[PDB]
Design an enzyme around this catalytic site. Structure first.
Site, PDB file in Angstrom:
ATOM      1  N   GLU A   1     -15.058  -4.432  36.615  1.00  0.00           N
ATOM      2  CA  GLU A   1     -15.530  -3.488  35.834  1.00  0.00           C
ATOM      3  C   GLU A   1     -14.337  -2.046  35.834  1.00  0.00           C
ATOM      4  O   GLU A   1     -14.194  -1.487  35.205  1.00  0.00           O
ATOM      5  CB  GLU A   1     -16.588  -2.456  35.464  1.00  0.00           C
TER       6      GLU A   1
ATOM      7  N   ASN B   1     -12.534   5.827  25.099  1.00  0.00           N
ATOM      8  CA  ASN B   1     -13.045   4.171  24.005  1.00  0.00           C
ATOM      9  C   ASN B   1     -12.848   4.821  22.565  1.00  0.00           C
ATOM     10  O   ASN B   1     -12.190   5.647  22.756  1.00  0.00           O
ATOM     11  CB  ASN B   1     -14.682   3.536  24.079  1.00  0.00           C
TER      12      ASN B   1
ATOM     13  N   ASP C   1     -14.313   5.006  19.938  1.00  0.00           N
ATOM     14  CA  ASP C   1     -15.561   6.177  19.363  1.00  0.00           C
ATOM     15  C   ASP C   1     -15.340   7.605  20.159  1.00  0.00           C
ATOM     16  O   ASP C   1     -16.609   7.802  19.031  1.00  0.00           O
ATOM     17  CB  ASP C   1     -16.411   5.192  19.314  1.00  0.00           C
TER      18      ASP C   1
ATOM     19  N   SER D   1     -16.073   7.711  23.147  1.00  0.00           N
ATOM     20  CA  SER D   1     -16.843   7.816  23.884  1.00  0.00           C
ATOM     21  C   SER D   1     -16.046   7.238  25.496  1.00  0.00           C
ATOM     22  O   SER D   1     -14.841   6.576  25.242  1.00  0.00           O
ATOM     23  CB  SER D   1     -18.289   7.005  23.834  1.00  0.00           C
TER      24      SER D   1
ATOM     25  N   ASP E   1     -16.078   5.412  29.680  1.00  0.00           N
ATOM     26  CA  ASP E   1     -17.307   4.196  30.741  1.00  0.00           C
ATOM     27  C   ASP E   1     -16.898   5.334  31.799  1.00  0.00           C
ATOM     28  O   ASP E   1     -15.862   6.134  32.295  1.00  0.00           O
ATOM     29  CB  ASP E   1     -16.947   3.159  30.578  1.00  0.00           C
TER      30      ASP E   1
ATOM     31  N   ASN F   1     -21.846   3.715  29.935  1.00  0.00           N
ATOM     32  CA  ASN F   1     -20.877   4.944  28.944  1.00  0.00           C
ATOM     33  C   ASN F   1     -20.952   6.154  28.413  1.00  0.00           C
ATOM     34  O   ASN F   1     -22.721   5.661  28.503  1.00  0.00           O
ATOM     35  CB  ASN F   1     -21.105   3.763  27.603  1.00  0.00           C
TER      36      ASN F   1
END
Ligand SMILES: [Ca+2]
Length: 125
Positions: A35, A46, A48, A50, A52, A59
């Site tokens: 990760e 991301n 959308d 968002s 991480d 998130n």
């Protein structure tokens, strides 16, 4: 900070993560390696809107609040900025909530793609 695998292992154990939802330590470590490469400052933006955050890439649409994500639920009740510092205590406590609702490590797309069914001998504690 880029943690050493044994600091990561100590934190996991101290947070009661060994056997939590029958998830062994090598699984948690492999997840964190794929990760974020153990980077407590890792971030990923991301499509959308968002992002991480941190070592377990938590998130900001569902778990933490960053003040700029549409439809934020802030389910861990924590600022995402608290997931970019050097103490992973709160990061690990949020991850327990994530893993507990999914009953496993399926929320993390790196675990599924790079850990499930692969050798984990490189990730032992
Ligand atoms: Ca933290």
């Amino acid at each position: 900070k880029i943690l050493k695998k044994q600091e990561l292992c100590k934190n996991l154990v101290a947070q009661g993560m060994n056997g939590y939802q029958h998830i062994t330590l090598p699984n948690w470590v492999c997840t964190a390696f794929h990760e974020s490469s153990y980077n407590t400052r890792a971030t990923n933006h991301n499509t959308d809107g968002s992002t991480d955050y941190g070592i377990l890439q938590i998130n900001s649409r569902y778990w933490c609040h960053d003040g700029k994500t549409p439809g934020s639920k802030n389910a861990c009740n924590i600022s995402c900025s608290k997931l970019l510092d050097d103490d992973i205590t709160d990061d690990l406590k949020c991850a327990k909530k994530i893993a507990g609702e999914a009953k496993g490590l399926t929320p993390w797309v790196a675990w599924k793609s790079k850990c499930r069914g692969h050798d984990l001998s490189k990730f032992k504690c």
